[PDB]
Amino acid sequence: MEIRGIFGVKVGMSQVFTTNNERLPITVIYCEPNQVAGVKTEAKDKYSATLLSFDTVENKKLNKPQQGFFEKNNLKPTKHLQEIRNMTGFEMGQQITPQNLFQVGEYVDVSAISKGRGFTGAIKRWNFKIGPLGHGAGYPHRFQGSVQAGRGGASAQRVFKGKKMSGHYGHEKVTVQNLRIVGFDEANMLVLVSGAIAGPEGGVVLIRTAKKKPGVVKPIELAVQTEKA
Amino acid sequence: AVQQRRSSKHRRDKRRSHDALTAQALSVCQKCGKKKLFHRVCSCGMYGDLRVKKAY
Amino acid sequence: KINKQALIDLVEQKQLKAYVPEFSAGDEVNVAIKLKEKEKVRIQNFTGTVLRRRGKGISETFIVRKTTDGIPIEKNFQIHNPNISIELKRRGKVRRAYISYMRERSGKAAKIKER
Amino acid sequence: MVSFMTRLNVADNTGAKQVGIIKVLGSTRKRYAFLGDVVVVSVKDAIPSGMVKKGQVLRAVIVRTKKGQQRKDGTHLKFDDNACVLIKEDKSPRGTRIFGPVARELRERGYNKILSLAVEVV
Amino acid sequence: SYINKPGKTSAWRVMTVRQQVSAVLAYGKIETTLKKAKNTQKRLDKLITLAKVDNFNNRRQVKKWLLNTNLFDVDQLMDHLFSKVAPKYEKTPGGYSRVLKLGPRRGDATEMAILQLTD
RNA sequence: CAAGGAACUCUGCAAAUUAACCCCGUAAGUUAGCGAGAAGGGGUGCUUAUGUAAAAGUAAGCCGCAGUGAAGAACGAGGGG
RNA sequence: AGCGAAAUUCCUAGUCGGGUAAAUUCCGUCCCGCUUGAAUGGUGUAACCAUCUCUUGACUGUCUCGGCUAUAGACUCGGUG
RNA sequence: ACCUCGAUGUCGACUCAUCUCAUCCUCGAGCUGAAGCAGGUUCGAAGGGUUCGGCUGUUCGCCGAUUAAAGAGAUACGUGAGUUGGGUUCAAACCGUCGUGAGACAGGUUGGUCCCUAUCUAUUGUGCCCGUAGGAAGAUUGAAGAGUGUUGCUUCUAGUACGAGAGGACCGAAGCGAGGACACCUCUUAUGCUCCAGUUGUAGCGCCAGCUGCACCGCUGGGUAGUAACGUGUCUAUUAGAUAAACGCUGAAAGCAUCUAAGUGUGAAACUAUCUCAAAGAUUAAUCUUCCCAUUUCGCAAGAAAGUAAGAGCCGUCAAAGACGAUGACGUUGAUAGGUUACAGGUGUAAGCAUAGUGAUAUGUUGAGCUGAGUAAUACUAAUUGCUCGAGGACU
């Protein structure tokens, strides 16, 4: 199925009361109209994708190769360049606006880098039960568990590859699927997305067309206060 | 815990290939000779203006 | 690209009112709850003291605590939730922004009141 | 949070004074006794002028949770004690009267007949 | 593991911060570890900014952040502050002090640095 | 450290609540000495006033979430070998 | 004589009653007690127990299921080793 | 008794599990003395799930409550350089027995040492150097991979097929949940040791008040940010191909028949993709993009005076990162950090003043005062007036 896409940065989180007397936690994403840097059909490079530019910056804060590439095709000098698969409907030099890409209440997936917490221990990484603390505890009482699969000459005689063990955690591209967009703001280039999005504010945020829902539309509506003293 | 077979001298000489410091930066102060480290004060007690300290 | 990180309230501004009175914890208020069971829109009455006043903009939440027939009841309200009418009945001397004494304080002891 | 082997007070005319939840129903290790579920209980202390005595086990419905849960309506509810209503293994209960306010979120799971005999609903 | 020295707990840290800022106010230049001086400059400029009001409330507030030295007593230090410290720092908002990087120490080889007052 | 309160574990092991002051109250059994601080409850701050030698003691008034505000002061009950 | 599935019982996880949502542990009672049992003492016995065990009240991060803070250590830089 | 005695550490639970299929569940199919529900048995299918307690030291087992079920095993009857010692296996003692006695008993009971800073492999991440067709910056390709791939309940179809009545669906749809995975901090909590309020004991600021130092952060109630969860959102699937058991179509040997030999299909949570993640050290070291160099004259233009302009490194300021290394943002066109101003947020009426009151205290200035991280503007201070690597296309 055809998949549209857009880029932006999360700036905050709030909640919005919707219809049927309930709420919805919302994140607010500030996107900026972009320039289509390139489109590649499957007859030129065999991968039909679209390279887009975002986070526009001045020219005197960019290296020679990227600025030369940008001025070659008469595009804005931009900071970030990234590709999105399966999108060919647009063309060079066209701007992309979120209001002209989706409907009021369709489903779109989101992706962003993870909020790394450093060299996170095994327990937090895989939710392993802590050892007993009373009736004696030994030297360790917080460890990944025995990775042994068998002693002897040839039963295991090896620590199996890919066993869940402490190490780097976070700072890895993660995604959230099946989320509903509610509100738009054209005067500030602002969008509202239900749920929570991984990654701290200031990082890269990508919104793509959902795959588990191939683009089905079901409306979502919010109420308006009408009470005055 | 200890090793089974003793590590040879060439294993040691291979291991220490990375335990080597990175050299510092030489700098010539505008109002002091005796070339110094970059981004610090000089030996003549200066920093290009500001005679903030003596040489003692 | 440059942002204020305050647009959260800039979009929150549209879902506010002026009906909501300014009030703090330690006062007795009675609110009305609108309930919709697809028909017969029902109006409730809920009286009690305010426990806390936290949050800003649309995140302002507060608590109502009441004691009926020996059973305590506690409810939490988002201020700008739809169909929430709130009025001030009685206010007294406030001491703390959030109060933690409503479980061992009973009647026959004069609760503080001011002008 | 009302976990395994938890004391709670009876809230109906069953002849008991103190009841204890022993095993939750539903799925394994669900460790939850939130409003609207059905749970196995065992009466601890019973006095005359009632209908049932200690020793036997029953299936009841929990009503009061001290911690309280955030409802899907945007409002949070809290309690200062935990209580349950004894039923006779069907929709209709053994209880004839209810002490204190009860919840309403259990309306979708039935039991409106029991809900109809409470002093007030919050 | 077992019993050890109390270390660099928060109370000790703030006490040393106040001692260092009082000393640098009394004399003017202080050589020490770079990180500690950088941390203490916050409190230093806080006190300097709050001292320009020249009111008894400000005196009472800054009293609990100053410890006397051999050169000046607490009253002497406050008199010096009201005499020749405030008026110079009215035409320049914030950043009254500067910090520069000294060479490494002989024994510990940690980055020494000087902190001084300026226009 | 929310809610639960012994449900993990061989075992309430280890930890936590009761602590001092004075005032009530304290059973079966008992070699009548004990059991016993049994158990189970009250309050202790401040100001003024009354008093005896000062105190100890009492009345009135003040406030907080808390008044041996800090620290140092006992977990019991019952049934057995 | 007294006592008794007693830490003495292999059969036995003996019977039964009680405490329990459920008791190979506990209390009491039932005797064909392998080989109980009297100065290798037998039987109760008030108070004592860093004695062992059983039930229970409150209180408990032991636990449901973990979480945060501070330090010292650890860890990079220097010296020694 | 063939390896082990100049060491092969045995029971049990805890954490982590992995693997096989004689399948406990979910899946499909046949048969049936299967009206339906509900069964009984057999056939393929191991991706996933496979509960909590009381008893004894525990597997064995009993019992209780339940679950779609509460699998059968192995891995030194898995894992003491991972804990725990309850049992077994120490020196003490008791009781029964045995023995004339030292003493013993697969008889019973109470107490009681559990060490090791990791060299390599393996593994978890992580870097420095070189490498790829001259050198940089990038954007992709996905070869070979990994992770994820449980499901329950109620309602509708419907009291419909069926059966007589009673009773009571296969096939699909909707919502509500519980396990476990991914993140988030708007609400709710926990935490929050340079925050706010209150307050005791003391030592000082000569003294009243107000302060700091200490007393578990002195104590108690809150709370910025960050941080997490008991909290909130999503995931649990839809589908395609080839299929296993099966069911077929037509059609043969041997004019019939036949699901099979040819040809052709339908067909299971399994297999390969659609889901997510990483990925050219993928030597098959891949494609494309841009930027720069090829500069008269000297053995192999070989370093011959110009050794990139492209960029990177040294050093500095920092957290969206962070054990160091790395990543990311910026180094005077400069907002990178610390300031100053503005505000949010938290606390809750600052001190002093006036005044009622015998006096604690109360009342108005005062929703003021204060503030660690927060959101911004502002060159105020620090990032300085710097140094180094870095080119003549190697092979058609």
UniProtKB/Swiss-Prot annotation, chain A:
UniProt keyword annotations, A-Z: Ribonucleoprotein, Ribosomal protein, RNA-binding, rRNA-binding
Biological-process GO terms, alphabetical: translation
rRNA-binding in keyword set: yes
One GO CC annotation: cytosolic large ribosomal subunit
Domain of life: Bacteria
Entry GO MF terms: rRNA binding; structural constituent of ribosome
Residues forming coiled coils: none
Oligomer and partners: Part of the 50S ribosomal subunit. Forms a cluster with proteins L14 and L19.
Role played: One of the primary rRNA binding proteins, it binds directly near the 3'-end of the 23S rRNA, where it nucleates assembly of the 50S subunit.
Assigned protein family: Belongs to the universal ribosomal protein uL3 family.
Identification of the protein by name: Large ribosomal subunit protein uL3
Span of the entire protein shown here: 1 to 229 of 287
Curated annotation (Swiss-Prot), chain B:
PANTHER family hit by this protein: 50S RIBOSOMAL PROTEIN L32, LARGE RIBOSOMAL SUBUNIT PROTEIN BL32
Name by which UniProt lists this protein: Large ribosomal subunit protein bL32
Protein family (similarity comment): Belongs to the bacterial ribosomal protein bL32 family.
Highest rank taxon of the organism: Bacteria
Region described as Disordered: 1-20
Keyword Ribonucleoprotein listed: yes
Biased composition (Basic residues): 6-17
Pfam assignment, any one: Ribosomal_L32p
A GO cellular component entry from the record: large ribosomal subunit
InterPro entries in alphabetical order: Ribosomal_bL32 (IPR002677), Ribosomal_bL32_bact (IPR044957), Ribosomal_zn-bd (IPR011332)
UniProt KW keywords: Ribonucleoprotein, Ribosomal protein
Lineage of source species: Bacteria, Bacillati, Mycoplasmatota, Mycoplasmoidales, Mycoplasmoidaceae
Transmembrane segment boundaries: none
Membrane among keywords: no
Molecular functions (GO terms): structural constituent of ribosome
GO BP annotations, alphabetical order: translation
Curated annotation (Swiss-Prot), chain C:
Superkingdom, natural source: Bacteria
Keyword Flavoprotein: no
GO molecular function: structural constituent of ribosome
GO cellular component terms given for this protein: cytosolic large ribosomal subunit
Residues forming coiled coils: none
Membrane-spanning intervals of the chain: none
Keyword Glycosyltransferase: no
InterPro entries membership: Ribosomal_bL19 (IPR001857), Ribosomal_bL19_CS (IPR018257), Ribosomal_bL19_sf (IPR038657), Translation_prot_SH3-like_sf (IPR008991)
GO BP, one annotated term: translation
Pfam families, A to Z: Ribosomal_L19
Keywords: Ribonucleoprotein, Ribosomal protein
Biological function: This protein is located at the 30S-50S ribosomal subunit interface and may play a role in the structure and function of the aminoacyl-tRNA binding site.
Family: Belongs to the bacterial ribosomal protein bL19 family.
Identification of the protein by name: Large ribosomal subunit protein bL19
Organism lineage: Bacteria, Bacillati, Mycoplasmatota, Mycoplasmoidales, Mycoplasmoidaceae
Protein encoded by which gene: rplS
From Swiss-Prot, chain D:
Segment forming the signal sequence: none
Domain of life: Bacteria
A cellular component annotation (GO) from this entry: cytosolic large ribosomal subunit
RNA-binding recorded as keyword: yes
rRNA-binding as UniProt keyword: yes
GO terms for MF: large ribosomal subunit rRNA binding; structural constituent of ribosome
GO BP terms: translation
UniProt xrefs under CDD domains: Ribosomal_uL14
InterPro entries hit by this protein: Ribosomal_uL14 (IPR000218), Ribosomal_uL14_bac-type (IPR005745), Ribosomal_uL14_CS (IPR019972), Ribosomal_uL14_sf (IPR036853)
UniProtKB keywords: Ribonucleoprotein, Ribosomal protein, RNA-binding, rRNA-binding
Family assignment from sequence similarity: Belongs to the universal ribosomal protein uL14 family.
Function: Binds to 23S rRNA. Forms part of two intersubunit bridges in the 70S ribosome.
Subunit structure: Part of the 50S ribosomal subunit. Forms a cluster with proteins L3 and L19. In the 70S ribosome, L14 and L19 interact and together make contacts with the 16S rRNA in bridges B5 and B8.
UniProt name for this protein: Large ribosomal subunit protein uL14
Recorded name of the encoding gene: rplN
